[PDB]
Structure formats: structure tokens, C-alpha cells
Design a protein around this ligand. Sequence first.
Ligand SMILES: COC(=O)[C@@]1(Cc2ccc(O)cc2)OC(=O)C(O)=C1c1ccc(O)cc1
Ligand SMILES: COC(=O)[C@@]1(Cc2ccc(O)cc2)OC(=O)C(O)=C1c1ccc(O)cc1
Ligand SMILES: CC(C)=CCSP(=O)(O)OP(=O)(O)O
Ligand SMILES: CC(C)=CCSP(=O)(O)OP(=O)(O)O
Ligand SMILES: CC(C)=CCSP(=O)(O)OP(=O)(O)O
Ligand SMILES: CC(C)=CCSP(=O)(O)OP(=O)(O)O
Lengths: 399, 400, 400, 399
Amino acid sequence: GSRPWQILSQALGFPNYDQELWWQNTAETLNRVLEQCDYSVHLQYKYLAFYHKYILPSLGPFRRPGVEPEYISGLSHGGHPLEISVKIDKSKTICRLGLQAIGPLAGTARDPLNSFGDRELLKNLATLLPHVDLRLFDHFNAQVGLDRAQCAVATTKLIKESHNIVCTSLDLKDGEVIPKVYFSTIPKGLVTETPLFDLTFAAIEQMEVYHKDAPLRTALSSLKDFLRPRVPTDASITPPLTGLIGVDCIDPMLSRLKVYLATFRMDLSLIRDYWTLGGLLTDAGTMKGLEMVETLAKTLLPFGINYAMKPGTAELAPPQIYFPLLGINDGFIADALVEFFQYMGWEDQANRYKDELKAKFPNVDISQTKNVHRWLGVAYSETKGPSMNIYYDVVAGNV
Amino acid sequence: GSRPWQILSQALGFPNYDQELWWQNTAETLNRVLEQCDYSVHLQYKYLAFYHKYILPSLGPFRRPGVEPEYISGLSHGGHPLEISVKIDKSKTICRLGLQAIGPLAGTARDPLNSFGDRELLKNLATLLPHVDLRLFDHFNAQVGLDRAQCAVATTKLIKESHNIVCTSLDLKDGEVIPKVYFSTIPKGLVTETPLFDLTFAAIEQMEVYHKDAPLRTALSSLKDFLRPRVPTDASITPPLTGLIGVDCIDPMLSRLKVYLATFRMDLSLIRDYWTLGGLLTDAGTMKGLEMVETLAKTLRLPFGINYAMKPGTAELAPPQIYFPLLGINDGFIADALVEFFQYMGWEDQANRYKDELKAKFPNVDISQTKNVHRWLGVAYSETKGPSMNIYYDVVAGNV
Amino acid sequence: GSRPWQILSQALGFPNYDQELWWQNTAETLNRVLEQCDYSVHLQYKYLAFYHKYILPSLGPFRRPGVEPEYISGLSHGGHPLEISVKIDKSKTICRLGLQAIGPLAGTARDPLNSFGDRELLKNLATLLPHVDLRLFDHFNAQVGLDRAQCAVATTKLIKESHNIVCTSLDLKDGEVIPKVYFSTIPKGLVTETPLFDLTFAAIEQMEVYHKDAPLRTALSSLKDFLRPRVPTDASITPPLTGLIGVDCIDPMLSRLKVYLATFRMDLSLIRDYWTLGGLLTDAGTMKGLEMVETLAKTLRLPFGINYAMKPGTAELAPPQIYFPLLGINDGFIADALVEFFQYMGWEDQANRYKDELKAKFPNVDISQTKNVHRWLGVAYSETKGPSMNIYYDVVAGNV
Amino acid sequence: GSRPWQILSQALGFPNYDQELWWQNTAETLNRVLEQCDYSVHLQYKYLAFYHKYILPSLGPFRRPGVEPEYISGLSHGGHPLEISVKIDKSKTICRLGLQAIGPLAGTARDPLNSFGDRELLKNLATLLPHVDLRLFDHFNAQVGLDRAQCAVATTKLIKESHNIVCTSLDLKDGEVIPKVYFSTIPKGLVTETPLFDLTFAAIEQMEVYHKDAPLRTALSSLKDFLRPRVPTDASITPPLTGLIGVDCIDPMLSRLKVYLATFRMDLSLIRDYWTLGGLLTDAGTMKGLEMVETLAKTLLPFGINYAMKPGTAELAPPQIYFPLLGINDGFIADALVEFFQYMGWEDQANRYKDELKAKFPNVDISQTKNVHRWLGVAYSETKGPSMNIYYDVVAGNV
Ligand SMILES: COC(=O)[C@@]1(Cc2ccc(O)cc2)OC(=O)C(O)=C1c1ccc(O)cc1
Ligand SMILES: COC(=O)[C@@]1(Cc2ccc(O)cc2)OC(=O)C(O)=C1c1ccc(O)cc1
Ligand SMILES: CC(C)=CCSP(=O)(O)OP(=O)(O)O
Ligand SMILES: CC(C)=CCSP(=O)(O)OP(=O)(O)O
Ligand SMILES: CC(C)=CCSP(=O)(O)OP(=O)(O)O
Ligand SMILES: CC(C)=CCSP(=O)(O)OP(=O)(O)O
């Protein structure tokens, strides 16, 4: 064969069988996504060669019948620590990878919450890529990381699929690899009996950039004013809750700080309350985005609400909202998205979605699966416009 | 041979020649120091095996004639990223290793200040040892580390032996390995054109434990009041200066925070000023330590060091540890001086064995002829623990 | 804990969980065997450190409930590629390790018969140990190894526990590590449809040392004359058969060449036929060994083994080593039988300690309840060295 | 940049600085050679990704001012264990890599003759490539390899650049990687005081394939009849001598066995004696090849003569002859080859040689270098026709 995923298999082979199985269950889809997103052949080789060298060893064992790994990830249905997502606009689509980098003692007494593998991966990316900055990672790792004893405590109070402290995404954008990370607040909250709100904002307010940037301190107090009445004041894990803190692994003055809420209830009034920050945002841009989100939910794991802030900007923007799609028929989802894209006037996206979906996941019949689409994120930005993020359980789509 | 260093060579061999050379110029001395400090044979194997597995690969290429590494360390005279030290009390002597963990791209464009190797080692120590903790490492790495472009700027403003941000020490204490790290403030100060005093305290004041611990804040407040009129208010790298921030890689509530001053000027009057915090400390214990330190200086190039160590839950400053620079002074003279100081302290047994044991620690060089083997001598007095002496050796200088 | 196996765990930790599990189910027993054989503490550290560094990564995944490796070994009952043996004389007891070095793609399409891992280990042993020699390994790898397509054919004609071409033993003798290997003739016989006898002797007769050494050729000629009417002339895999070729990984002029027969039928008459080479050997030493072997059999599923060992510069065959298969027979009964045989041999001290030491070697299982821990018992008599007994243990079966 | 060598640098980075320097001094030229030989872009990525993963770590340290490695290779002027060669016909050109794979203790007491690194590389290729066969390697490694003590002896009697037992070539042909190896007879001859002739033929006559193939035994006795009067009968290292044994790492029934003579004298009468095997080959094909070789030498380290035999074939063919080009001006060499290609009627090769040469080695002025062309090999085959092999010191052409 002569497609890049095939050529790279032929050129590089595999250090071990797990890496080979990961390639066999993901690289073909990845090359198809890249192709369908109009990445050049040179960028397809770039990202697939990157994937081979850096990501395959980070994915740990390939969970399969008869081989049960010590560490089970909540990123996918089968426990595989990988997702592939697309960020769609009217005119372009970006591919992103989401993973946990699995350490070799992950899920055992010497590393109960997989505390080390992501930062090792990011260390290797820092020597690969000139623009990668580890200072925000390190800052939040210091604030919400746990020692081994604490990690062992947390594993006693959390389901197997939530034994995590961090996870990593890689945006494959502008011919670069752009890393970002999310940190879990729940283990520290549980182990220290600290309110999740308190620890989130304590960690944020100790950032060097917070100390240097008045506009960020302005946006953050507004967010605190919105969130304080809505999340617990005590130490319980009662949604709605501040469950993740996200940063970009770039210059801290350029990084978006993300505060992610998880909740199990989402009805119209809450979508409204989240999206407008309780009536704080009432401008036409926010309201057009709201219409979009209400329409999506009508046309169609916790819900996600992600508030993203940037140094230099004092005003909050509407969040990105995440809908879990696990349990919903994938062909139905496809047909609903086609409708939604037509509603948005993204005609070319509507005309190609379903056929391109089948071509991403040729081993599976999408009319009969319910776990291939895992999440959908919807956003509206004053400057970039509407976008949709679709997260796929790539392993479910290949096995 | 059947000594532990030899047995482990025979059992383990070496992955590459540089590691073999490191072992050949350090492992015998380390085994000797361990023996001399009355470590059991089982602990000697524990530490030498640990050294072989964890430390040898972290030391990088062995700088030698015809082979010049990309990365040159300031830890030793020959550019080797290694020191061995002993801390001597009344009751016992502890051995400690000091290194920089050299990344494989260190001192090139992809890693100009060797920014990654020490954290890599510490990660490996965290799955090895159950009480190793990375949170203070990570905090100070966030606050005084630099991105690649900044690291590149810093190499244009620093001599080649100062292209570093962190180094690591490992106390071989009880039967454990206890890691500590020290972060340099100079690269960030130079790149951001920020006074060293300001960026040092800015980084400390953002610690989680600073926010939780009134006693630590109070101690730090007293230290700032002492330091502010003595160290530069401008961005200059001139003495005395706040050059390093030390932490123990343990539960941050138990970690000592160390602020290390470097300076070239020292006389009995400055000894008193540092030791007593300009008259703040006046008690019997402080004045007794002061007398000891004065006597050492009388009995006796790199800067002097002054290390102020603070613990969460302690509100008051104690006197610092004072480090005497010994590079360039003949090592036989130093051994005679130490024998004298030991007798002055009443440490007869230490006085009577110091010279013979020195010879025996460095059998492949005549230590009476060298001037680089003793690098530093630190002296401290604790109300709790009594007086102690830290002797730091350039092990490679004592072996090549 | 302060025993060497514990100290090395504490010093070294583990690269991954499988290695940790291997250490947790084998290292205590190995330390016990070493102690029991009167190895000094320095040798105990030497061998345990060697085991940790070289052997743990070679053992592959630790087969356990919920985790089924791609490659299953025939060396043990649970599929683990490991055995520990002791060779007991009048004067002393030597410990030996037996393993297959598992490649990372072993038992998949890219490496169906685990064809690479053992040579990789041996390469690492050659830079570790100065008297390790790869030439006979390489010779037999050339003559009875198979390419990938052939290896794939062989997996269709063999049970999963027999997907192998080579295995390795390491004698822990004097203060050294002495490697030996054994090559299987079965895969090549099956794939090429060639009689095992023919391909075994073809491979031997192409040795450089065969061409240089008349005495070896003469010995081999006598062995062929004995074997030819007893083993199949056709291509069948039926007993008695020439199933393994053993060599020592040393100077080929000093290496013993071993031809190992497997067979299921054994009674006193066949014992005599094997031991005396069908009446060829009639001397006092041979008949005395014969009596010993007969008594063992009376005192006492896997095939019997018969191992004919030949040395360059020796023209005459000596009696073989005979291996009794013990899998499935209760281990407390075996211990009682061995005590009886030891008393018969006059080895009182061995008789008096066998059972207590067995218990102590396998402290996490009750060896009186098991039937898989003793796997093999080999017995030999040398004119030169006297009688000896090799006991092979499924260490993992004695620990899980 | 977007050329494959650049893309792969961006995607993969480097495990260490030596590997980065090797890439910086060879990968650009390699991509240019591949390009100039009309390899597709997919094969350029195949071979460059292979190069990165398998060959860079095998090349050991990058010898440079201030960094003197323990092991110095005789493959190049600067001591670098690498060459890049092209095999030219009238219609196509094949690129090949020649190296020694450098072990981490090479040239020190634990590995005095670099005895291990090639077989480790070949082990990794055997899991990469289905067609790679290690049985001939192992056979000859057993016959001419030395133990450590013996290796240490040999290093006392041989120059630093001849402390070798094996070397490896990789033909980049038909979208595959095809390995072949040469083994050095000199260390064993020196250490055992055995005649080189005796040990060469002893090793060959112990091959399993020799025992199975009458035609090969027929060709080999003819070669012995030719060589016995011409090389030493005693154990001295007096050229002409049988100095290398070459095999292909493939099915032993398909492998060409090569017996390489080294000599320091080459005049017309010897070229004649070698090429015709002493008057044994007098057919028109042999004689047309002879004309070619005589013309080449007129138009333009020991000389090389390589006799290659294949199982199933009883008759010998003319050897390939190797001319060392070290010390001769590279622009002169270029202009001479241009003339030679015109004499052969390879007009298109003549018209492109010099410009393509400069483009392979843009960092150097070929009119002023004398070490870029290291060797030239000339062959004539009954079935494939004439061919020329040109061996470049790629590091000399880049530094
Ligand atoms: C927001 O949802 C999540 O936190 C996770 C894991 C999870 C958490 C709680 C649940 O009840 C079910 C799943 O579900 C996911 O699909 C997912 O990607 C989760 C996740 C996984 C790894 C992390 O490091 C963080 C979040
Ligand atoms: C035929 O020439 C050679 O053997 C080598 C090494 C060499 C050998 C003898 C000399 O007088 C000068 C150089 O010169 C080379 O250019 C070369 O590639 C040689 C060589 C290198 C590595 C090997 O493993 C075998 C031969
Ligand atoms: C971890 C999960 C489920 C969502 C993360 S938010 P995101 O970073 O993917 O969203 P954007 O990439 O910022 O558009
Ligand atoms: C490495 C340098 C110059 C000083 C280190 S201070 P220290 O950690 O050795 O002092 P203590 O070990 O706390 O006595
Ligand atoms: C591995 C099997 C079944 C037999 C090995 S025979 P051996 O090498 O153990 O016999 P000796 O060690 O030579 O006594
Ligand atoms: C090692 C040297 C200098 C020559 C080897 S002969 P060769 O294998 O390169 O020639 P062919 O590839 O067979 O054309």
C-alpha cells in the first residue's frame, strides 16, 4: 500500500505488539481524517510520523479480550486512552488528538492516578517543538497534583475510569502540533476535603500571569460572581461542579485559561443560565449563539460547560457547551448533524458529513453503533464565529 | 574484587562507555565514604546500586581530553555535573550526592539551559520512593523556568558553566534517598531584567504553602527585611545576591525553603551580620554558633554562601548555614585546618581520622598535592541538633 | 527488609509492572536458594543485581489472570519462561537459571517462534562478561533457525507451548555467570519434512570444531551408531527422538556439545540401554552409576530426557545425564523420595536438610500441597567428578 | 520547509545531539539522491523515515572537532561509519547505504572490534521486513567472529580504521530495503595465524547451501583453482588477498556469495588476469566488459576485486572491480565520468552527472575537493549488462 499510514508502518515497524495494535486500530482513520480535512500530503506524513514516534508509546497497552491493563481510561467506551476530534467551521476543519499518556506503572501502587506520563510526553514535545511552554502545566500540576499516599486514597473513592489527574490534547493546526492540558480537581478536593470551587480559584489566583494581568483578574472575579451561587460551598462532589482546569502549553500571556463545569442536569433554563452567565451577557452575538445551541439540542457522562479566558481581556465570553452522545445511534447523530449544518448554512459540510463519517470508520456500520460519536462541543466566538467540535471514540470505530 | 562497587560493576556492567568512566572515577570513592560513615554493607549495596541505575545515566558524557561535551557544569572544576558531600555531627556522618541531571540535548538549541533532565530523574525517583514529592519542584520550575527562546537569550548573558536553572542533591540518610533541589534565579533575572530579590520573593509568595502558613510568611517577612538593604534593589548580578532557592522534594508542609546568598566579601564583621541577622538574634545558642564560625574562619575562587532555611510552622529565623569556598586552596592544608577545628569543637575521633580517611577516599590521586578536591565547607548550629559541618568534594578531581 | 532481594527492590525499583511482578514471585526464592548453597552475601548481591538488570526485562509479561501474553512458554506449568535449578554434589550446590528471553513481538506475525530475544540477551552478556562467546550460538542459529515464513508454518504444526527454537541457562558458578543454550530441532524438522536425526547431525557436522577435532568426530560417530537404530529414520516426531542440541557459550574448543533425547517409555531395561550405550560401556564407574540411577527410579506428564554430552578432545562417550519428569507428582512425596535417595547415596547432610530448605525456598505456597513445583530431576555420574543431582523448579508455581 | 527530510525532522526531532548532527550532515543529500533517482515521494518518506528510526541510532557519535569517538571507521575520510552509493545503468539508478552499526562500547575493552552492533541492527530489520534472513550472517559470524580476548589481540596488530569484523549495506530497491553484509577475514587470520585463503574457503565449505548445491561447489572449486596460485599460502597479510566475504541477508538459496580480493597493485595485465579469471572467461560478453574497464581506467586504499556466485550456477562470471578515488579531484572525476558515460552511450547520464553531483553536495565546491568520490565499482553481467557503482563520503560532502 502507498497511503502515508501504510508507508510509515512499512518504514518504521513497531517496538512492541501493543504499539502495532494501536496503529492497526487508529492510524488508518487518522490518515482519513487528515485527508478529508484537506491537509497536504507533507502534513499527513508530518502528523502520522509524529503519531508513530510520540503518541503510540504514550498510549500504553491496547486493551483487548484476554489482556486487561492495569490502567483503564475514561476517554473511551473500551477504556482506551484516546479520542480523535474535529473542530468544524463553515470553511475548514481541524483534527485534534486527545489522550492520557500512560506511564509504565500506571494504576498500580507506584502510580495510582497516572501522575507522570503526560508531563514526560510534554518534556519530549518541548525538545521537539520551539513554541511549547511547560510553565502553566507545572504550575497547575503543583497546585492540584497529589503525592502517592494521596493518590492511593483517591483511587479508593473514585471509579476506575476517573483515576486521573491530567489529560492532554494536541491540536494539529497551521502545520504545527499545539498541546493543551486539563487537570482534574476532584482527586485533590476528595483527599483534602476542600471545596472544588476554593481549590480551583486558589490555584488560578497563584498563577504568575494572574498577578501580572488586571484584565484577567477582572474576568475571573466576574466568573467567580457567577459560579459561587451555583456550585458547592462545601467539599462535596455534587454537580454542578468545577471539575477541570484547562491551559494551553504556550507562553503564559497567550494561553487560554479554561474552567470546566460538569453537570448531570441540562434543560433549557440551565442552558440559558450557563450560556449568558446568568443574564450577564445579553448582546446579539451571545443570543445568536444561544439560538444555535437550543436548535442543536432540539435537533439531536455529564454535560460540560467550559469558560475560557485569555490574559488581556476583561469581559467574559459565552462558554463552550459539551453534549455527551454515548448511547445515541451514530447514524441518527449523523442525520441530525446534517440537519444542523443545513440550519447553519454550512451546506458543503452537510453534504459530506455522513459519507465522510462512514469512510473514517469503515470497519463498523454507523446505523448499528451507539458509541462512535462520544461528545459534541458547540461554541460561538465574537471574532471567529460558530464552531462545532465532534469527538470520536476512534477505537470503537475500528474494532 | 569483592567490595560492593566492584561486585556491582561485575553484576551490572555498563550501557555505554561514559557510564563506565563515571563509575571508574567515582564509585570506589563513594563506596569508601559509605564505609567510613558506618553504613552497613546492605546500605552500601543499596546506595551503590541506586547510583548505578539512576545516577550514572543522569550524569551525561564524561568530560575528558579529546571529548568535550555540549554541556559544561559549574558543579566541579573539570566541568563534571557531580559532587559528593558528608555532613558530620557529634553522633554520625551522612553522605550526600549533588548533581545536574544532563538531558540528551543539553547545551544545544533544543535545550540550552538543561531544563528537563532533573525533573526526569525526579519522576523516576517518584515511582521508586514512596515519600518523594514533586509539587515544590513543579512550583519553582513554573516560577523561575524559562521557555526555549528565553533560555537561548540567557546563554548569551552567561558563562558556559552557568547555563543551568536547577540542580539536585540526594541525602543518603537513614536507609532512604531524600531529594532536594535548588533553582537559580539568575537566568530569569537576566532575561526579564528583574531584580533577583524581587523575583525570588515573588516566586516564594506564590507557593500554596505560603498562602496556608502564617508562620512561614512571618519568617519570610523577617528575612526580606534583613535582605532588602543588603542585596541589590536594581537588576544587577552583584553581591551579596539571592542566587538560589532550595526545596526538599517532600510533602510541602514538611519541606525546608532555603534562600541562598552568594557573596565574595567576608570578614568577622560580615560573619556576625549574616549569622545574627544584623542583631535580630542575640541568644546563647546563636552567640555560641557565632564563635564557632569565627574560629573556623580564623583557622582557614568561588563565592561564600549564606543559606537561610525556613520550615512551615516555624515563625522565627534561625542562623544560616555559612559555606566557605575552598577551591584553589591546597587540600593537605585544608585537612590540617579541619583537624584543628575538629579538636577545637571537641570532636577528637573526627580529628584523629580525618586525614587518613581523606587519603583512603581518594586513593588514585595524592590529595596532599591537589587544590580542587575540597570545594566547599558549610557550617551550621542548630538549637535542636547542635553543630554540623558539610564538606563538599569534587569527586572527579579526586580520581582522575 | 534488609535481605539482598529486598534491598535491591528498594534501590532499583522497576521499569514496569511486569518486572515488578516477576521480582515479587521469584526474587525471594532465588535469594533463599543462593543462601542455602552457601554463596557469600557479596555473591548474593552480584547474582540478584544481575537478575534484576539482565533477566527481568528478558522474561516478558507476567502471565496472570486477566492478562494473557502473546507468547506462552513450555518451560513451566503456568506458561512462565523461567526455571530455577540446583546441581548438588558431595562437596557443593550450584544454582542455575533457565529462561527464554522474550522478544517484544514474540508470538505475533513479526516473530512467531521468539527467534531474537535470546541472542539479544547473549549480546548483552558478551559486553558484560569477558569469557562469553557467541560463535556456537551463531552456528546453531544458522543451522536450525527459520525465516519468518517458515516460523509461521511451524506455528500451525505445533502446540502454543512449543513455539520456540532456543532457550538459555545461566550457571551461577564460582563467582561467574556461565551461559548455555539449547536449540530445538523440531521446528526445522517439521517445516522441512526432514528426520530429526539427520538434521541434528547435519548441523553438528558443519561445526568449525567438528572439522578441527578428530576426538569429537569419533565420539559423535559412536553416538550416531547408538542412536540410528533407536530414533526414527522417518520424519516423525515420535520417541525416542533427538529434540535439542545444547552448547556452552564459551570458547568452542572448551564447549560441551549436548544431544538431548526425549522419550516417554522408561523402565530398568531402557535405563541400562541409555546409560551404557547398549553395552558399549561396561567399566566399574559406569555400572556403579547405573546402580544409582536404577535406585532413584525405584525410589520415585513430561517426557524423560537423556543427555549425551561431548567435549572437544574427548574421543569416548561417557554415560548420559538422565532427567526424570516430575510434573504432576506431589512435591511432598518428591521431597520424601529425595531424602531417601540422599541417604542411599550417603549424603546425610543433604537428606537432613532437604525438606526444611524446600519449605523455606517457597514460603508463600505450601509445597506439600503442590504437584508442579518440582519439574525435573537429572542424575549423572562422572568418572572425574562423582555423582550429581540437578533439581529443576517451577519457581513461579512455588510462589503464586 | 516542506521537503521530506525537513518534514521528518519537524515530526520526529532527535533523541540526542549526535543523531541530530548525523541528520544535519546527511539527510538532505540522501533526499536529493532519492529525488534524482526518480523515487516517488511516498518512497522518499519511506526511506527517510527508515533512516531516521533505524540508521541514525546505529551511526554512533558524530565525529567532529573537539569530540573524538572511541571507534573510528574506515568507511570514510573523517572516520564516520557511513557512505551513500548509487548503482547506475543506462536507464535507472538505485541508491544504497553502507554503514557500520556502532555499538555503545565499540572501540573499548568490552567491544574492541565493534562485534555486536550490526547484528542488533539486523535483528531490528528482521522484525521490520518479512524477507530479511539472518542465517548467512549468523553462519559467517560464527566462522570469522572472535572472542573478546582475540578481538583485543587484533586491535594491537591493525590500524584504528581496520578494527572491524563486519559492515552492512542496505539497497533501497523496488520499494524495499535489502540488506547485505561483508565480513572481515583479516582479524581471524591474524589472531589464529591461519592463511586467509584457508579460512575463507573453510567458512564457505561449511555453509549449509554449499552442502546442498552441486553447481555452487562447481563454481567455487574453479574460483579456488584461480585464486590458490595468486594469494598467500602462508598466514601473512600480503596482498593480493581474500579480505572480505559478502552475503545477502535473504533466503540462503537466493543469496549471492561474494569473495573480495584486496590488492595494492593494478596494471593492465592484472586487470586482465582478474577480469578473465586467468584466461578462463574468453567469451564476447566478458571481453566487452573488459574493454569497458580498460577504458574507464584510462579515462580516469586498495583496489577491490569481487567475485560473486549464486547457488544453482556452476560457471563463474567476471568480478566487479573497485577503484579507490581518494586523493583525486572530484570535478576531474565528474568530468571523466561524463566522458565515460558518453563512451558507454549513456547520454542522459552524461548530461546530468555533474550538475546532479553539485546538487547532492551543495556545501562543498567539487572543483576543490578530493574526498567526496571515494570508490567506483564497475561490473558487466551477461543478463543485466554493464553497471557502475559510485560511493560517496557523504559526510565529506556536507561538512
Ligand atoms: C467529563 O467526563 C469525564 O470526566 C470523563 C470521565 C468520566 C467521569 C465521570 C463519569 O461519571 C464518567 C466518565 O468522561 C469522558 O469521556 C472523559 O473524556 C473523561 C475524562 C477522562 C480523562 C481525564 O483526565 C478527564 C476527564
Ligand atoms: C577495502 O578498503 C577497506 O578495507 C576499508 C578500510 C581500510 C583497510 C585497509 C586500508 O589500508 C585502508 C582502509 O577502506 C574503506 O574505504 C572501507 O570502506 C574499508 C572497510 C571498512 C569497513 C569494513 O567493515 C570493511 C572495509
Ligand atoms: C476533555 C474534554 C471532554 C473537552 C476539552 S475542551 P476542548 O479543549 O477540546 O475545546 P477546544 O479545543 O478549545 O475547542
Ligand atoms: C549545592 C550548594 C552550593 C549548596 C547546597 S546547601 P545543602 O542542601 O548542602 O545544605 P544541607 O544539606 O541542608 O545541610
Ligand atoms: C532445560 C532442560 C529440559 C535440560 C537442560 S540439561 P542441563 O544443562 O541442565 O545439564 P547440566 O547443567 O550440564 O548438568
Ligand atoms: C564494502 C565495499 C567497498 C564494496 C562492497 S561490493 P557491493 O556490494 O557494494 O557491490 P554490489 O552492491 O553488489 O553491486
